[PDB]
């Protein structure tokens, strides 16, 4: 496993984690929008 | 050097995701507290 | 993959990113050091 095989692997892992994380971000953002409408 | 750029990009993404993770976690607790106050 | 928590996965990923970065730094520094010895022998 070259340094470069490790880098490539980590780039993939960060991409998978980010996609998953982005779904949480969208739901968090929707939650703020819902609260905003309930508050006002 | 493309290795340096790759490493820098990977560091930035993991830092961005971990700081956003903390922010969203705080915001969800804060939203719960407001939602509690809206009822009571 | 594993029944790790998101937090564990991210912590693990931070550590691997840190290890590979450190590894790259050590290799670069090692190369410099070899070059310093070669420089001293060549002037």
Numbering used by the authors:
A (entry chain A), B (entry chain B): 25 to 64
C (entry chain C): 22 to 64
Study text:
Hence, we further purified the tag-free A27 protein (aa 21–84, C71/72A, named as tA27) for X-ray crystallographic study. The tA27 protein was crystallized in the P43212 space group, and a native dataset was collected to 2.2 Å. Finally, the initial phases of tA27 protein were solved using multiple-wavelength anomalous diffraction analysis of tantalum bromide cluster derivative crystals. Monomers composed of tA27 protein fold into single α-helix structures and assemble further into a hexameric structure using a trimer (which corresponds to the crystallographic asymmetric unit) as a building block. The trimeric building block of tA27 contains unusual triple-stranded coiled-coil interactions with two parallel α-helices (chains A and B) and one antiparallel α-helical strand (chain C) using the N-terminal region interface (NTR Figure 1B). The antiparallel α-helix (chain C) uses its C-terminal region interface (CTR) to form a bridge-like structure that connects two trimers into a hexameric assembly. This unique type of parallel-to-antiparallel interaction within each trimer is distinct from the classical parallel trimeric coiled-coil structure common to other viral fusion proteins, such as influenza virus HA2, although the individual coiled-coil of tA27 and the heptad repeat of viral fusion proteins are structurally similar. Due to the intrinsic flexibility of HBD, its electron density maps (residues 21–44 for chains A and B; residues 21–43 for chain C) were not visible. In addition, the Asn75 side chain OD1 of chain C forms two hydrogen bonds with the Asn75 NH2 of chains A′ and B′.
Mature vaccinia virus has more than 20 envelope proteins, including the A27 protein, which has multiple functions in the virus life cycle. During virus entry, A27 mediates the attachment of mature vaccinia virus to cell surface heparan sulfate. A27 also tethers a viral fusion suppressor protein, A26, to mature virions. During virion morphogenesis, A27 mediates mature virus transport in infected cells.
